[PDB]
Design a protein around this motif. Structure first.
Motif, PDB file in Angstrom:
ATOM      1  N   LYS B  13       0.695  -1.477   0.387  1.00  0.00           N
ATOM      2  CA  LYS B  13       0.215  -0.622  -0.049  1.00  0.00           C
ATOM      3  C   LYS B  13       0.863   0.801   0.043  1.00  0.00           C
ATOM      4  N   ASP B  14       1.366   1.336   0.650  1.00  0.00           N
ATOM      5  CA  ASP B  14       2.869   2.246   0.605  1.00  0.00           C
ATOM      6  C   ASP B  14       3.294   2.822  -1.163  1.00  0.00           C
ATOM      7  N   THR B  15       3.578   1.876  -1.801  1.00  0.00           N
ATOM      8  CA  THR B  15       3.861   2.077  -3.304  1.00  0.00           C
ATOM      9  C   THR B  15       3.074   2.974  -3.793  1.00  0.00           C
ATOM     10  N   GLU B  59      17.737  -3.927  22.723  1.00  0.00           N
ATOM     11  CA  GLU B  59      18.486  -5.600  23.204  1.00  0.00           C
ATOM     12  C   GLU B  59      17.471  -6.304  23.315  1.00  0.00           C
ATOM     13  N   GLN B  60      17.074  -7.244  23.130  1.00  0.00           N
ATOM     14  CA  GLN B  60      16.435  -9.044  22.241  1.00  0.00           C
ATOM     15  C   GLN B  60      16.242  -9.240  23.964  1.00  0.00           C
ATOM     16  N   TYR B  61      15.896 -10.224  23.593  1.00  0.00           N
ATOM     17  CA  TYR B  61      15.896 -11.410  25.069  1.00  0.00           C
ATOM     18  C   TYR B  61      16.758 -11.979  25.368  1.00  0.00           C
ATOM     19  N   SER B  63      19.522 -11.436  25.232  1.00  0.00           N
ATOM     20  CA  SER B  63      20.576 -10.589  25.359  1.00  0.00           C
ATOM     21  C   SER B  63      21.779 -10.052  24.008  1.00  0.00           C
ATOM     22  N   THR B  64      21.059 -10.064  23.239  1.00  0.00           N
ATOM     23  CA  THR B  64      22.054  -9.457  21.795  1.00  0.00           C
ATOM     24  C   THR B  64      20.551  -8.407  21.131  1.00  0.00           C
ATOM     25  N   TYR B  65      22.126  -7.405  20.853  1.00  0.00           N
ATOM     26  CA  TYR B  65      20.771  -6.199  19.858  1.00  0.00           C
ATOM     27  C   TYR B  65      19.991  -6.477  19.242  1.00  0.00           C
ATOM     28  N   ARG B  66      19.357  -5.044  18.479  1.00  0.00           N
ATOM     29  CA  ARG B  66      18.718  -5.042  17.579  1.00  0.00           C
ATOM     30  C   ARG B  66      19.435  -4.095  17.027  1.00  0.00           C
ATOM     31  N   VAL B  67      19.099  -3.693  15.744  1.00  0.00           N
ATOM     32  CA  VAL B  67      19.454  -2.610  14.726  1.00  0.00           C
ATOM     33  C   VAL B  67      19.121  -2.897  13.458  1.00  0.00           C
TER      34      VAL B  67
HETATM   35  C1  LIG Z   1      17.331 -13.425  18.783  1.00  0.00           C
HETATM   36  O1  LIG Z   1      16.212 -12.745  19.029  1.00  0.00           O
HETATM   37  C2  LIG Z   1      16.005 -12.141  17.140  1.00  0.00           C
HETATM   38  C3  LIG Z   1      14.621 -11.837  17.461  1.00  0.00           C
HETATM   39  O2  LIG Z   1      13.941 -12.468  18.175  1.00  0.00           O
HETATM   40  C4  LIG Z   1      16.700 -13.144  16.806  1.00  0.00           C
HETATM   41  O3  LIG Z   1      16.795 -12.490  15.611  1.00  0.00           O
HETATM   42  C5  LIG Z   1      15.406 -13.643  13.922  1.00  0.00           C
HETATM   43  O4  LIG Z   1      16.457 -14.141  13.356  1.00  0.00           O
HETATM   44  C6  LIG Z   1      15.748 -14.711  12.477  1.00  0.00           C
HETATM   45  C7  LIG Z   1      16.690 -16.350  11.626  1.00  0.00           C
HETATM   46  O5  LIG Z   1      18.456 -15.883  12.343  1.00  0.00           O
HETATM   47  C8  LIG Z   1      15.367 -14.364  11.890  1.00  0.00           C
HETATM   48  O6  LIG Z   1      14.169 -15.348  10.892  1.00  0.00           O
HETATM   49  C9  LIG Z   1      14.134 -14.829   9.292  1.00  0.00           C
HETATM   50  O7  LIG Z   1      12.704 -13.859   9.009  1.00  0.00           O
HETATM   51  C10 LIG Z   1      12.203 -13.437   8.264  1.00  0.00           C
HETATM   52  C11 LIG Z   1      10.682 -12.814   8.423  1.00  0.00           C
HETATM   53  O8  LIG Z   1      10.598 -11.324   8.843  1.00  0.00           O
HETATM   54  C12 LIG Z   1      10.223 -11.567   9.830  1.00  0.00           C
HETATM   55  O9  LIG Z   1       9.550 -11.534  10.677  1.00  0.00           O
HETATM   56  C13 LIG Z   1       8.932 -12.530  11.991  1.00  0.00           C
HETATM   57  C14 LIG Z   1       7.379 -12.197  11.613  1.00  0.00           C
HETATM   58  O10 LIG Z   1       7.326 -13.551  10.787  1.00  0.00           O
HETATM   59  C15 LIG Z   1       9.364 -10.599  12.927  1.00  0.00           C
HETATM   60  O11 LIG Z   1       9.911 -10.923  14.061  1.00  0.00           O
HETATM   61  C16 LIG Z   1      10.453  -9.964  11.392  1.00  0.00           C
HETATM   62  O12 LIG Z   1      10.866  -8.761  12.199  1.00  0.00           O
HETATM   63  C17 LIG Z   1      10.004  -9.822  10.470  1.00  0.00           C
HETATM   64  O13 LIG Z   1       9.021  -9.079  10.182  1.00  0.00           O
HETATM   65  C18 LIG Z   1       8.975  -7.647   9.910  1.00  0.00           C
HETATM   66  O14 LIG Z   1       9.962  -7.252   9.709  1.00  0.00           O
HETATM   67  C19 LIG Z   1      10.309  -6.038   9.050  1.00  0.00           C
HETATM   68  C20 LIG Z   1      10.178  -5.326  10.650  1.00  0.00           C
HETATM   69  O15 LIG Z   1      11.166  -3.501  10.334  1.00  0.00           O
HETATM   70  C21 LIG Z   1       9.379  -5.050   8.209  1.00  0.00           C
HETATM   71  O16 LIG Z   1       9.503  -4.646   7.655  1.00  0.00           O
HETATM   72  C22 LIG Z   1       8.404  -3.178   7.306  1.00  0.00           C
HETATM   73  O17 LIG Z   1       9.181  -2.513   5.927  1.00  0.00           O
HETATM   74  C23 LIG Z   1       7.429  -1.656   6.116  1.00  0.00           C
HETATM   75  C24 LIG Z   1       8.312  -0.703   4.322  1.00  0.00           C
HETATM   76  O18 LIG Z   1       7.321   0.531   4.151  1.00  0.00           O
HETATM   77  C25 LIG Z   1       7.218  -0.910   6.519  1.00  0.00           C
HETATM   78  O19 LIG Z   1       7.988   0.193   7.323  1.00  0.00           O
HETATM   79  C26 LIG Z   1       6.631  -1.797   7.749  1.00  0.00           C
HETATM   80  O20 LIG Z   1       6.157  -0.503   9.042  1.00  0.00           O
HETATM   81  C27 LIG Z   1       8.066  -2.481   8.483  1.00  0.00           C
HETATM   82  O21 LIG Z   1       7.535  -3.044   9.527  1.00  0.00           O
HETATM   83  C28 LIG Z   1       8.175  -6.420   7.640  1.00  0.00           C
HETATM   84  O22 LIG Z   1       7.136  -6.008   7.179  1.00  0.00           O
HETATM   85  C29 LIG Z   1       8.057  -7.319   9.038  1.00  0.00           C
HETATM   86  N1  LIG Z   1       7.131  -8.549   8.565  1.00  0.00           N
HETATM   87  C30 LIG Z   1       5.892  -8.452   9.311  1.00  0.00           C
HETATM   88  C31 LIG Z   1       5.429 -10.139   8.332  1.00  0.00           C
HETATM   89  O23 LIG Z   1       5.900  -8.351  10.350  1.00  0.00           O
HETATM   90  C32 LIG Z   1      12.771 -14.323   7.168  1.00  0.00           C
HETATM   91  O24 LIG Z   1      12.083 -13.743   5.596  1.00  0.00           O
HETATM   92  C33 LIG Z   1      14.092 -14.765   7.007  1.00  0.00           C
HETATM   93  O25 LIG Z   1      14.288 -14.925   5.352  1.00  0.00           O
HETATM   94  C34 LIG Z   1      14.616 -16.293   5.739  1.00  0.00           C
HETATM   95  O26 LIG Z   1      16.206 -16.348   5.789  1.00  0.00           O
HETATM   96  C35 LIG Z   1      16.438 -17.900   6.140  1.00  0.00           C
HETATM   97  C36 LIG Z   1      18.283 -18.028   5.901  1.00  0.00           C
HETATM   98  O27 LIG Z   1      18.141 -16.797   7.428  1.00  0.00           O
HETATM   99  C37 LIG Z   1      15.938 -18.949   5.376  1.00  0.00           C
HETATM  100  O28 LIG Z   1      15.851 -20.723   5.299  1.00  0.00           O
HETATM  101  C38 LIG Z   1      14.586 -18.827   4.280  1.00  0.00           C
HETATM  102  O29 LIG Z   1      14.362 -19.221   3.091  1.00  0.00           O
HETATM  103  C39 LIG Z   1      14.029 -17.195   4.273  1.00  0.00           C
HETATM  104  O30 LIG Z   1      14.930 -16.713   3.145  1.00  0.00           O
HETATM  105  C40 LIG Z   1      13.926 -15.648   8.344  1.00  0.00           C
HETATM  106  O31 LIG Z   1      13.341 -16.359   8.584  1.00  0.00           O
HETATM  107  C41 LIG Z   1      14.031 -13.137  12.193  1.00  0.00           C
HETATM  108  O32 LIG Z   1      13.187 -12.214  11.397  1.00  0.00           O
HETATM  109  C42 LIG Z   1      14.639 -12.514  13.598  1.00  0.00           C
HETATM  110  N2  LIG Z   1      13.941 -11.845  14.311  1.00  0.00           N
HETATM  111  C43 LIG Z   1      13.814 -10.244  14.064  1.00  0.00           C
HETATM  112  C44 LIG Z   1      14.643  -9.615  12.569  1.00  0.00           C
HETATM  113  O33 LIG Z   1      13.256  -9.442  15.192  1.00  0.00           O
HETATM  114  C45 LIG Z   1      17.575 -13.928  16.389  1.00  0.00           C
HETATM  115  O34 LIG Z   1      18.335 -14.422  16.121  1.00  0.00           O
HETATM  116  C46 LIG Z   1      17.918 -14.269  17.874  1.00  0.00           C
HETATM  117  N3  LIG Z   1      19.566 -14.671  18.501  1.00  0.00           N
HETATM  118  C47 LIG Z   1      19.895 -15.914  18.667  1.00  0.00           C
HETATM  119  C48 LIG Z   1      21.553 -16.127  18.800  1.00  0.00           C
HETATM  120  O35 LIG Z   1      18.871 -17.036  18.439  1.00  0.00           O
END
Ligand SMILES: *[C@@H]1O[C@H](CO)[C@@H](O[C@@H]2O[C@H](CO)[C@@H](O[C@@H]3O[C@H](CO[C@H]4O[C@H](CO)[C@@H](O)[C@H](O)[C@@H]4O[C@H]4O[C@H](CO)[C@@H](O[C@@H]5O[C@H](CO)[C@H](O)[C@H](O)[C@H]5O)[C@H](O)[C@H]4NC(C)=O)[C@@H](O)[C@H](O[C@@H]4O[C@H](CO)[C@@H](O)[C@H](O)[C@@H]4O)[C@@H]3O)[C@H](O)[C@H]2NC(C)=O)[C@H](O)[C@H]1NC(C)=O
Ligand SMILES: *[C@@H]1O[C@H](CO[C@H]2O[C@@H](C)[C@@H](O)[C@@H](O)[C@@H]2O)[C@@H](O[C@@H]2O[C@H](CO)[C@@H](O[C@@H]3O[C@H](CO[C@H]4O[C@H](CO)[C@@H](O)[C@H](O)[C@@H]4O[C@H]4O[C@H](CO)[C@@H](O[C@@H]5O[C@H](CO)[C@H](O)[C@H](O)[C@H]5O)[C@H](O)[C@H]4NC(C)=O)[C@@H](O)[C@H](O[C@@H]4O[C@H](CO)[C@@H](O)[C@H](O)[C@@H]4O[C@@H]4O[C@H](CO)[C@@H](O)[C@H](O)[C@H]4NC(C)=O)[C@@H]3O)[C@H](O)[C@H]2NC(C)=O)[C@H](O)[C@H]1NC(C)=O
Lengths: 208, 208
Positions: B13-15, B59-61, B63-67
């Motif tokens: 929708k934003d685009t 910082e996540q739970y 113990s690793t940050y979020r950038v």
């Molecule tokens: C400590 O904990 C942290 C978190 O608790 C762990 O980090 C996690 O690591 C995971 C893997 O290492 C990672 O998994 C990956 O997930 C993504 C999906 O991303 C979404 O996942 C969740 C929803 O299901 C959500 O929590 C995430 O934040 C993502 O959702 C959101 O992402 C963006 C947030 O800013 C949004 O962008 C939006 O942009 C618009 C712009 O117009 C707007 O601005 C909007 O407001 C923004 O929010 C998204 O829209 C939003 N989406 C949703 C549905 O909410 C998968 O796609 C990844 O891809 C996979 O990669 C695999 C290899 O890595 C591969 O096998 C597979 O085929 C696929 O390619 C992946 O699975 C997870 O996201 C991440 N958590 C985060 C980042 O919060 C951390 O690992 C952990 N540390 C240790 C050590 O364990």
């Protein structure tokens, strides 16, 4: 450095049809080219089983092997929530790795099946869309087909299940048919296969 | 041990809306508590723009940050398919990590939007399902909402796009409302936003 284990459930349609073979699949990745031998032990409910079939190694672009063992499950035991355990052992791997999967836990709930005729607006085009709405079922394992006059109907498309806020799932199926056939009042039928239905099966017809 | 980068596209929708700001968001997890500094470099189609916003570390739970670093994109710059790059640098990270996304190329195609009243068998429950069938659009980027009397309704669930065999996508949306509001003749409306529609916008009204 070290093999890792992922255990995958059977496919839903395989679990619900007596003619198909449901199977649990134990996948092991990150096995060394140095030590490429893995041993699998399978336990159903604790009781060890010996008829699992192992496939040949295949090396990944990662330069590591991926080895898989598939275990056929009895439809009933899966249905009744029996635990399927996969223990793997590798010599480049200190202690065996175990994994357990099973049917999704929770109170099964019966799906409601509704059939919706094409929108009036679609009664414009040579082809119309017949809709099957399946909502409120748990678990998400389900299978939907279409039939007419006792024969299968080919070109339908089904969505994956979507988790509704109450904890159940819904999906939709779209069977597209020639409007000639629909306007003749031919009776189309949506088949639904789910654990929670009586005899795991229900049909819902649609025409006028 | 080691950071990881995930890079996501704008909200569909934003685009599609002149009054909204699409953004590309580059997330970095598994960053060290000892090394919390991360620098971003944003490459549009190759050339550098330096206007991107970097969020503070959270910082996540585990113990690793979020950038997070977000860069606003111009609407047609995404819709014409220019690639957006996020290179990430960290001291607990030997070589930089790059990521790239872009609009899925292929000739865009106009979604068909048909609305289907409740099933007859559902006109006995206190809650009814209003169904929007959206079929035949490319690519999957799409936004679907519901209104009534010009006011948005929220209690709906939309499936994700499903690929048809011809190469297109379809979905369904299930707006649930109290039947008292359906049987009163309120005019419900499902809105569909897509790049292939004229004005990026269209609505279908349904009642009786
Ligand atoms: C400590 O904990 C942290 C978190 O608790 C762990 O980090 C996690 O690591 C995971 C893997 O290492 C990672 O998994 C990956 O997930 C993504 C999906 O991303 C979404 O996942 C969740 C929803 O299901 C959500 O929590 C995430 O934040 C993502 O959702 C959101 O992402 C963006 C947030 O800013 C949004 O962008 C939006 O942009 C618009 C712009 O117009 C707007 O601005 C909007 O407001 C923004 O929010 C998204 O829209 C939003 N989406 C949703 C549905 O909410 C998968 O796609 C990844 O891809 C996979 O990669 C695999 C290899 O890595 C591969 O096998 C597979 O085929 C696929 O390619 C992946 O699975 C997870 O996201 C991440 N958590 C985060 C980042 O919060 C951390 O690992 C952990 N540390 C240790 C050590 O364990
Ligand atoms: C070297 O490469 C290996 C892979 O090859 C790669 O080669 C390179 C060059 C590139 O091309 C790669 O892209 C290419 O993949 C790497 O192996 C991979 O390892 C990662 C992690 O180490 C694995 O990631 C896991 O993925 C599963 C999902 O598996 C499916 O993923 C894809 C599709 O998306 C598919 O390719 C993969 O094979 C699996 O798909 C299919 O799997 C079965 C195939 O046999 C199918 O079973 C079916 O069974 C029925 C029976 O009736 C029928 O017989 C069917 O025919 C049969 O096929 C299956 O249906 C099918 N499915 C699909 C969709 O295709 C995730 O689920 C994993 O789970 C996560 O794990 C992490 C922890 O690691 C957690 O953070 C997650 O939360 C989640 O785990 C949760 O927690 C615990 C576990 O800790 C669980 O109990 C919870 O339930 C989990 N929670 C939830 C909500 O699930 C995980 O992400 C990846 O699959 C591997 N690739 C394979 C096996 O091919 C090597 O790692 C790499 N080495 C190095 C050093 O990098």
């Amino acid at each position: 450095g070290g093999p890792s284990v992922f255990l995958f459930p059977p496919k839903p349609k395989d679990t619900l049809m007596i003619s198909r073979t449901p199977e649990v699949t134990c996948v092991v990745v990150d096995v060394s080219h140095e030590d490429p031998e893995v041993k699998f032990n399978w336990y159903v409910d604790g009781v060890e089983v010996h008829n699992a079939k192992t496939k040949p190694r295949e090396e990944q672009y990662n330069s590591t092997y991926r080895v898989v063992s598939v275990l056929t499950v009895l439809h009933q035991d899966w249905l009744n929530g029996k635990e399927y355990k996969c223990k793997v052992s590798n010599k480049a791997l200190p202690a065996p790795i175990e994994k357990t999967i099973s049917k999704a836990k929770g109170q099964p709930r019966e799906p409601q099946v509704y059939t919706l005729p094409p929108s009036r607006d679609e009664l414009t085009k040579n082809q119309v869309s017949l809709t099957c709405l399946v909502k409120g079922f748990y678990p998400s394992d389900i299978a939907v087909e279409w039939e007419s006059n006792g024969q299968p109907e080919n070109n339908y498309d089904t969505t994956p299940p979507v988790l509704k806020s109450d904890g159940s799932f819904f999906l939709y199926s779209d069977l597209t048919v020639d409007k000639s056939r629909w306007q003749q009042g031919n009776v189309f039928s949506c088949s639904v296969m789910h654990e929670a239905l009586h005899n795991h099966y229900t049909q819902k017809s649609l025409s006028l």
